[PDB]
Design a protein around this ligand. Structure first.
Ligand code: CLA
Ligand code: CLA
Ligand code: CLA
Ligand code: CLA
Ligand code: CLA
Ligand code: CLA
Ligand code: CLA
Ligand code: CLA
Ligand code: LHG
Ligand code: BCR
Ligand code: SF4
Ligand code: SF4
Ligand code: SF4
Lengths: 29, 133, 57, 117, 772, 151, 62, 80
């Protein structure tokens, strides 16, 4: 199963992709 | 001069005429007579100097076209009125009508070629320069 | 009205056409103000990285 | 999973349709924005533009040729069904495509394997 | 002052102009150079004002064209009586009006199309059968006393003589004796003659036909005499008139009772019954005769109101100038000059009235059926309601068109100074913005209820719906009006009226599901002619849909009239004309800003309006009114039959219209999908022409979208490559092929959209009701 | 999916054609005695299925046409092909003949009948004139006399 | 080129490009850029049947 | 503001000047045609882009050309 720890891990990985997307989108503008 | 006799309408000036620009058209009339407002409806011009405030230059030039075609009134003048109160004459610019050729005007917009000799858009790529130069 | 920053023609439009056309021309990088050929290819290469990342997300 | 097979076929054919239209769109954008007639003087690209009335008029012909007769055959068969004559339909056997299947080893009775199967 | 001024032979009758089409207008007289000339010829041919500036010559062309149109109608009517006489089962239908389907078009046997001749029309004299007709002509001919086909043939010949008279007078009053302009401007004399002579004496002479033909023929058929044996002149013999009507035609003599003012003898054949006769489902003929006698008296009276040549009477111009007030400036001054110098102003009014009257005809004919046994002919009832709804909608749009043409062509600022017309133009922004608001209000609060209901039902929340089984929206004002009219015959405000339409008697019921046989009017074939019509939540919702569609159609047409001459966008729009495509891509773009383009857009909204009305009529009548009664249980079995609404799940029984029409999915599933089973299964039988027309009309509708969605610059460039191939092979024509003009491409699109959409519903309706 | 190894055979062997053929003849005999005048009477229906007997039928029992050029089915498409191209070529050649002899655009909106009948009669034998104009290049205008657009 | 002669058009943006018109007027003056007036059998998309050309845009075919 | 350009094919017929509802155009003297005059576009900040001038121009392909450019309050034709 996807335990609650693994949901939390996935949001941390998603947060890092979010700041990476934030870096790219401001460098693009 | 005075305003033409008109009971008012909903097709006239808006807040643009208070804040940006409105237009003034001045003409002389020899006979009191009825004309169609460009705003919509009928008004009567006085026997004298007529002044009328309109929203656009095209509405002023449409009335001037009506004053020429229907009433043979020629001497219409159009002013651009700024919200501080400044009037700037915009029509006619040099006193001579636009259709008659006049020595003293500068040629504006002249391209010294026929239209099919304009350059290609690939020639003017990555510049603000246009092919009608 | 500074949006859209890539087009001063659109940015000085006082109507709602400024908003629609800024959206519609935003990815037409060749027609933007001040675009050069080199800066176009550099912007595309990075934009393509962003599209790839969306596919993986 | 029949719903998945239907969804996947339909998804990818509609995607293919948009990609085909966009290919011609950027081909049109190329001609207005990037096409230089001097650097492409008399090559195969400039020669397409040179006989473009022949291309468009023959494409116009094929589409009218297909459209008149295909619609005409469907309408003929619809009128036949309405009048109770379904044996008077125009039912054309697709023998050229059945020929293709037979070359790949489909066994269809009246259609020959040309090279031997 | 009322004289007759006529110029004698102003136009020679010669065929020299037939060698030159397009002679009448100065652009067209130079001959064709492009294919635009060909379309310009047809579009300008009846626009008589573009042909000359002479108002008298325009009035002469209109008067003569009116005779030609009347001749066309009389030829059409002559054909209807001819096909009834020689190509019909009228003889067998007269013996059995409830057992046999009327047919007056039979089909030659080539290509297998004689499948369209059906049994259930096959009878003696009509061996091969034919197409079932839905025009109701047999019910009308039987009502006015036609018994044999030999009488229809004489009527066919009489209509051809009236047509040849009308066509000759059009030649006469154009080429021989053409009236002057001041003859046409005698509107007071024209109103006097049309009220008293045309409408007044027309109704009085028709009363005489009703009294001496229609009443005694019906007296003989009610006696049991077969229609081949019916004496049609029986109302001209005073003795035979005595046996059917003992009081009115009696020893107390007929015309003796008239001149002594002993009119109470005439209550045998002139009544005030009101309701429907229970055997025929139709109005009493004695009521119809007294109606036409009473409105003949009022119309002949009304035709003496206006002053002509004998001092007495009203002057319309002095009447209009007197009806003014402070709130309205100079009031109706100048409108006499408008209405006597503008043919378009008169046409705008007269189309507005003729379209609105035709719609009143549609409502009044289903509810107060004048023709015996027609109320059980459901395909006839559907067709007649739908036909006159479409005719009325088209004429109202034409009223908007010619009001706009008046504003462009015939409006004058000098005539209209601070009058009613000038003051409407001076607040056109106030009128249109309020109309914009009320259409948005109506559209949100009517269609949004359907969307609310669709969503609530899909979400599994039927108690949150707007419905009779849920949150009700009762139309309490219409139910109040029904209560008033139910109580009114015999009651205080109409004490000697014996009945009214049965649609009112809904007091006394809360749904059409709980309807017993004593409340309905069923004929001897046990089919319901008419019933009380229950109005519930679904009727509240659809009536505000009607109000939405009418107000938007008004918004489009009135915006076209009020802004025909000018706008803030285009200040000199009147100089561009009534019909121009645009004023170019500038000012943001001005496509379809002309008054003509508002007529173009208004036609789609008229289409949307009438389509909802006839769909409402079809489903509501099938679910709530029409059907069969059982002689056991007193049970009313409607055509559709009573959905069960789950809701709890304690099921709730409603009629299918009340249970299902409250959301769009119900209209799609229970109306469009369910009732199309007749037309899509019609192949191989006699309704197969409707299945072909159903498919073909879908095609034409779709074909219209090529014109509506595209622009001519594409098509002209496509024609360039095709003209190249014709140029290359010496097959280019001298009349250069052009794409259709921008305006014509819109007109072609809307014509094929209307043709395809209307003919789809026509095929749908007629296959539905002729199959069940 | 079910492979059809034999999609087509002679109609007289297909039992769904024998269903239809007797069902159409029985409807034609029903309307001969105590009937109505129909498009296909009893002798008309006999000849109809006399033609369809040596045709190819599918399993539904309806005739199917073969348009591959095969000559036992030359009546299916190949013989109607020559009849079309002769009649359509006649109407095309006649309009081309009438266009060359046109006085102007007035001949295009008012048909000159003895000119039109003569061109429609001369068009009837069009390959007597067309192919000697088709190899000569007389069928076509040279390229510098036909307008084109910019490139 | 003179009045009356049949001429072909080399102006590529012209409606009548590669078509044969008739010279109606030749301006006898200097300083005028397009002096030759040509009349045609076909109207253009505006219904106009004449235009002015230079001699450098014409091909005499007669 | 739209760009209104005048090309050297102008015959000085003044029809574009009469057609213009905004008085964008005028005739100046010239030597390139027999009329001795050519259209000019000094007041294109009033041009709405209606292309009535292009409609009036008789020369094959036209001697006056409107290029729709940046939109202003004037060029959008707004009374508000
Ligand atoms: C990899 C695929 C791809 C890429 C990178 C592009 C990229 C582009 N397209 Mg193209 N195009 C594509 C596929 C693609 N397209 C497809 C599938 C179609 C068919 C729908 C088109 C049809 C098309 C048209 C008709 C146009 C473009 C235009 C453009 C440009 C501006 C986009 C914009 O700002 O819209 C804004 C986005 C929204 C409003 C949403 C940009 C160069 C436009 C352009 O400016 O060309 C010069 C333009 O007019 N494209
Ligand atoms: C069902 C709707 C419909 C139909 C039938 C058509 C048909 C056509 N389109 Mg159109 N199109 C449509 C919708 C439709 N379009 C829509 C919604 C758009 C978006 C605006 C377009 C946009 C479009 C473009 C951009 C192009 C086409 C082209 C074509 C032609 C294609 C070639 C062909 O098939 O020839 C066969 C012809 C048909 C199938 C048309 C019907 C012919 C009828 C059935 C014959 C009528 C006979 C009848 C007896 C006469 C009436 C008499 C009566 C008044 C008594 C054909 C005329 C192209 C073209 O012009 O090619 C040369 C082209 O370039 N269409
Ligand atoms: C104005 C409306 C109108 C319409 C729509 C029709 C329609 C028809 N008529 Mg009728 N008819 C009319 C008026 C009309 N008629 C009038 C005013 C008369 C003189 C009183 C007739 C006298 C008449 C006779 C004697 C016959 C018809 C027949 C027909 C049918 C075949 C058409 C035909 O034979 O043309 C032939 C084709 C052309 C003329 C092509 C051009 C068709 C349903 C025939 C019929 O019903 O067959 C059983 C038939 O025999 N008509
Ligand atoms: C009592 C005498 C009388 C009668 C029965 C009529 C009847 C008619 N007139 Mg009227 N008319 C009359 C007197 C009369 N007119 C007089 C005295 C004048 C001059 C003031 C006119 C001026 C007149 C005009 C200008 C027109 C009619 C038209 C008509 C027809 C209307 C269309 C219709 O409903 O059918 C109808 C036949 C219309 C018509 O259809 O003419 C053919 C029409 O255009 N009438
Ligand atoms: C213009 C319409 C019209 C015409 C032409 C007629 C014609 C006639 N009426 Mg009728 N009638 C009419 C309207 C008309 N009526 C109306 C409106 C009423 C209701 C008041 C009547 C009520 C009526 C009665 C009560 C009688 C007639 C009678 C007659 C006949 C006269 C016999 C005679 O004595 O010589 C004659 C056929 C008389 C008759 O002899 O009937 C057979 C007769 O007694 N009529
Ligand atoms: C008593 C009724 C009446 C009268 C006398 C007029 C008279 C006129 N109208 Mg008006 N009008 C009317 C009702 C009327 N109209 C209605 C009901 C509408 C709404 C549709 C209009 C909307 C309207 C518009 C939008 C315009 C007019 C115009 C005109 C003028 C010129 C007509 C012309 O030459 O077109 C020529 C007529 C044709 C080319 C034939 C029309 C064919 C139609 C469009 C399609 C027919 C198809 C048919 C229904 C089905 C056939 C299918 C089958 C063959 C397969 C003339 C003054 C024009 C004008 O400019 O006025 C100054 C104009 O632009 N009318
Ligand atoms: C189904 C397609 C469709 C829809 C939804 C609309 C909707 C509308 N039309 Mg359009 N129209 C249509 C087809 C349609 N039209 C077509 C095919 C044409 C071509 C002829 C036109 C041409 C046309 C003209 C000429 C005019 C309209 C106008 C209108 C508005 C009418 C007022 C109103 O009902 O406000 C209520 C709004 C609606 C009913 C729309 C949907 C809202 C519903 C209730 C759901 C709400 C969802 C919610 C907000 C989500 C959050 C409305 C926005 C008129 C207008 O603008 O007047 C104000 C007008 O003059 N239309
Ligand atoms: C003299 C008659 C004539 C001839 C010889 C041609 C020949 C041709 N046409 Mg053209 N065409 C014609 C009339 C003619 N056309 C007419 C009247 C129209 C308007 C409907 C067109 C619209 C048209 C289009 C859109 C296209 C062609 C194309 C073509 C070419 C391919 C064949 C084809 O597609 O036909 C198709 C024919 C039609 C669609 C029109 C047929 C309508 C009738 C039958 C023709 C009129 C006959 C005439 C009245 C007879 C008068 C003779 C009498 C006075 C003696 C071929 C060169 C195609 C092309 O360019 O290929 C390279 C193409 O795409 N034609
Ligand atoms: C409804 C109101 C009502 O019936 O008022 C009727 C009112 C009548 O005013 P007068 O007394 O001026 O009417 C004289 C009449 O002969 C009309 O000219 O008309 C108006 O005030 C103008 C209409 C504005 C109505 C806008 C809504
Ligand atoms: C306009 C334009 C453009 C575009 C174009 C397009 C879009 C195109 C398309 C096209 C296409 C879309 C094409 C396609 C084609 C394909 C092909 C060509 C294929 C073929 C194949 C084959 C032939 C194969 C064969 C075979 C078979 C069948 C089977 C057996 C095996 C084999 C393999 C042998 C561009 C951009 C360039 C630019 C310029 C302009
Ligand atoms: S798109 Fe058509 S209708 Fe709209 S402005 Fe351009 S030419 Fe006029
Ligand atoms: S586009 Fe319109 S406003 Fe501009 S110059 Fe031409 S005519 Fe004048
Ligand atoms: S630009 Fe055209 S319309 Fe204007 S003066 Fe020159 S030729 Fe005449």
């Amino acid at each position: 199963v996807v335990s609650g720890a693994q949901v939390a891990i996935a949001f941390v990985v998603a947060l890092i992709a979010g700041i990476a997307a934030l870096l790219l989108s401001t460098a693009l503008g | 001069g005075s305003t033409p006799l008109f009971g008012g309408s909903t097709g006239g000036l808006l807040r643009k005429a208070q804040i940006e620009e409105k237009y003034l058209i001045v003409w002389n009339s020899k006979e009191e007579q009825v004309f169609e407002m460009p705003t919509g409806g009928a008004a009567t011009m006085v026997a004298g100097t007529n002044v009328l405030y309109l929203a656009r230059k095209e509405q002023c030039h449409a009335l001037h076209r009506q004053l020429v075609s229907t009433f043979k009134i020629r001497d219409s003048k159009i002013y651009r009125v700024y919200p501080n109160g400044e009037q700037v004459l915009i029509f006619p610019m040099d006193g001579v009508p636009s259709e008659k050729s006049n020595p003293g005007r500068e040629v504006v917009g002249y391209v010294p070629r026929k239209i099919g000799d304009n350059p290609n858009p690939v020639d003017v790529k990555f510049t603000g320069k246009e092919t009608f130069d | 009205t500074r949006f859209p920053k890539f087009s001063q023609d659109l940015a000085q439009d006082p109507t709602t056409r400024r908003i629609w056309y800024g959206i519609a021309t935003a990815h037409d990088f060749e027609s933007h103000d001040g675009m050069t050929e080199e800066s176009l290819y550099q912007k595309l290469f990075a934009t393509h990285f962003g599209h790839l990342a969306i596919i993986f997300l | 999973d029949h719903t998945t097979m239907a969804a996947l076929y339909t998804h990818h054919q509609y995607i293919a349709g948009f990609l085909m239209v966009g290919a011609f769109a950027h081909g049109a954008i190329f001609f207005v924005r990037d096409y230089d007639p001097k650097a492409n003087e008399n090559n195969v690209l400039a020669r397409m533009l040179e006989h473009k009335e022949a291309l468009i008029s023959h494409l116009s012909w094929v589409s009218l040729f297909l459209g008149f007769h295909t619609l005409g055959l469907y309408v003929h068969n619809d009128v036949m069904l309405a009048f109770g004559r379904p044996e008077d339909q125009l039912l054309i056997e697709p023998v050229f495509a059945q020929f293709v299947q037979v070359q790949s080893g489909k066994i269809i009775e009246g259609i020959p394997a040309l090279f031997g199967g | 002052p009322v004289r007759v001024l006529v110029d004698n032979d102003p136009v020679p009758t010669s065929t020299e102009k037939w060698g030159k089409p397009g002679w009448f207008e100065r652009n067209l007289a130079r001959g064709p150079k492009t294919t635009t000339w060909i379309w310009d010829l047809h579009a300008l041919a009846h626009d008589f004002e573009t042909h000359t500036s002479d108002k008298e010559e325009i009035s002469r062309k209109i008067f003569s064209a009116h005779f030609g149109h009347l001749a066309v109608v009389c030829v059409w009517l002559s054909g209807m009586f001819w096909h009834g006489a020689y190509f019909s089962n009228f003889t067998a239908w007269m013996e059995n009006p409830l057992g046999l389907k009327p047919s007056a078009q039979t089909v030659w046997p080539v290509f297998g199309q004689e499948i369209l001749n059906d049994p259930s029309t096959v009878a003696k004299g009509f061996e091969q059968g034919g197409i079932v007709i839905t025009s109701g002509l047999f019910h009308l001919w039987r009502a006015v006393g036609f018994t044999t086909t030999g009488q229809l043939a004489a009527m066919s010949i009489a209509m051809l003589i009236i047509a040849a008279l009308f066509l000759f007078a059009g030649w006469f009053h154009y080429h021989k004796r053409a009236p002057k302009l001041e003859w046409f401007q005698n509107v007071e004399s024209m109103l006097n003659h049309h009220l008293a002579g045309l409408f007044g004496l027309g109704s009085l002479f028709w009363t005489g036909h009703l009294i001496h033909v229609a009443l005694p023929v019906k007296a003989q058929l009610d006696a049991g005499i077969a229609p081949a044996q019916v004496n049609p002149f029986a109302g001209l013999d005073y003795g035979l008139m005595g046996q059917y009507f003992p009081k009115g035609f009696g020893p107390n003599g007929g015309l003796g009772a008239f001149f002594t003012l002993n009119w109470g003898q005439f209550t045998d054949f002139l009544t005030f019954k009101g309701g429907l006769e229970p055997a025929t489902g139709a109005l009493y003929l004695t009521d119809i005769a007294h109606h036409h006698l009473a409105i003949a008296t009022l119309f002949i009276i009304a035709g003496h109101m206006y002053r002509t040549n004998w001092g007495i009477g009203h002057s319309i111009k002095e009447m209009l100038e007197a009806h003014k007030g402070p709130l309205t400036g100079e009031g109706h001054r100048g409108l006499y000059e408008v209405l006597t110098t503008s043919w378009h102003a008169q046409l705008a009014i007269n189309l507005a009235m003729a379209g609105s009257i035709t719609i009143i005809v549609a409502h009044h004919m289903y509810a107060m059926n004048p023709y015996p046994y027609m109320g059980t002919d459901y395909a006839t009832q559907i067709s007649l309601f739908t036909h006159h709804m479409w005719i009325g909608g088209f004429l109202i749009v034409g009223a908007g068109a010619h009001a706009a043409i008046f504003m462009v062509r015939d409006y004058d600022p000098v005539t209209n100074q601070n009058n009613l017309l000038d003051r409407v133009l001076r607040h056109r922004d106030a009128i249109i913005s309020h109309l914009n608001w009320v259409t948005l209000f109506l559209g949100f609060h009517s269609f949004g209820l359907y969307v609310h209901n669709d969503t609530m039902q899909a979400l599994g929340r039927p108690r949150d719906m707007f419905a009779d089984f849920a949150i009700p929206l009762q139309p309490v004002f219409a139910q109040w009006i029904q209560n008033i009219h139910a109580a009114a015959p015999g009651g205080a405000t109409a004490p000697w009226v014996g009945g009214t339409s049965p649609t009112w008697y809904t007091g006394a019921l809360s749904s059409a599901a709980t309807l017993q046989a004593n409340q309905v009017l069923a004929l001897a074939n046990d089919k319901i002619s008419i019933s009380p019509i229950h109005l519930g939540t679904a009727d509240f919702m659809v009536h505000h849909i009607f109000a939405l569609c009418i107000h938007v159609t008004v918004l489009i047409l009135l915006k076209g009239v009020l802004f025909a001459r000018s706008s803030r966008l285009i200040p000199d729009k009147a100089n561009l004309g009534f019909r121009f495509p645009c004023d170019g891509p500038g000012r943001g773009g001005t496509c379809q800003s002309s008054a003509w383009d508002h007529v173009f857009l208004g036609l789609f909204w008229m289409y949307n309006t009438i389509s909802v009305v006839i769909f409402h009529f079809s489903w509501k009548m099938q679910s709530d009114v029409w059907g069969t009664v059982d002689r056991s249980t007193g049970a009313v079995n409607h055509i559709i039959g009573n959905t069960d609404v789950l809701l709890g799940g304690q099921t709730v029984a409603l009629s299918q219209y009340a249970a299902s029409s409250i959301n769009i999915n119900g209209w799609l599933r229970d109306f469009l999908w369910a009732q199309s089973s007749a037309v899509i299964n019609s192949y191989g039988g006699p309704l197969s022409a409707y299945g072909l027309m159903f498919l073909g009309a879908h095609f034409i509708w779709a074909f219209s979208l090529m014109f509506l969605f595209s622009g001519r610059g594409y098509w002209q460039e496509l024609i360039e490559s095709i003209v190249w191939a014709h140029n290359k092979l010496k097959v280019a024509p001298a009349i250069q092929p052009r794409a259709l003009s921008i305006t014509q491409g819109r007109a072609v699109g809307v014509a094929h959209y209307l043709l395809g959409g209307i003919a789809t519903t026509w095929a749908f309706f007629l296959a539905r009701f002729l199959a069940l | 999916q079910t492979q059809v190894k034999d999609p087509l055979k002679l109609c007289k062997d297909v039992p769904a054609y024998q269903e239809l053929k007797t069902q159409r003849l029985e409807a034609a005999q029903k309307a001969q005695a105590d009937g109505k005048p129909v498009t296909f009477n009893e002798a008309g229906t006999k000849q109809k299925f006399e033609r369809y007997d040596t045709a190819y039928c599918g399993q539904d029992g309806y005739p199917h046409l073969i348009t591959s050029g095969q000559l036992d089915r030359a009546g299916d498409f190949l013989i109607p092909s020559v009849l079309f191209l002769w009649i359509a070529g006649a109407l095309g050649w006649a309009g081309r003949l009438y266009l060359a002899e046109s006085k102007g655009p007035e001949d295009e909106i008012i048909i000159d009948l003895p000119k039109a009948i003569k061109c429609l009669l001369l068009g009837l034998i069009w390959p007597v004139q067309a192919i000697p104009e088709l190899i000569s290049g007389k069928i076509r205008v040279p390229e510098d006399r036909v307008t084109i657009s910019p490139r | 080129i003179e009045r009356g002669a049949k001429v072909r058009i080399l102006r590529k943006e012209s409606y009548w490009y590669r078509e044969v018109g008739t010279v109606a007027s030749v301006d006898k003056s200097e300083k005028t850029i397009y002096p030759v007036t040509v009349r045609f059998e076909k109207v253009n998309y505006s219904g106009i049947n004449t235009n002015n050309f230079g001699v450098s845009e014409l091909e005499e075919v007669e | 503001s739209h760009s209104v350009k005048i090309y050297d094919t102008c015959i000085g017929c003044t029809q574009c000047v009469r057609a213009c509802p905004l008085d964008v155009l005028e005739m100046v003297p010239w030597d390139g045609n027999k009329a001795g005059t050519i259209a000019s576009s000094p007041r294109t900040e009033d041009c709405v882009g209606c292309k009535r001038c292009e409609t009036a121009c008789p020369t094959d392909f036209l001697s006056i050309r409107v290029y729709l450019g940046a939109e202003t309050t004037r060029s959008m034709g707004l009374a508000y």
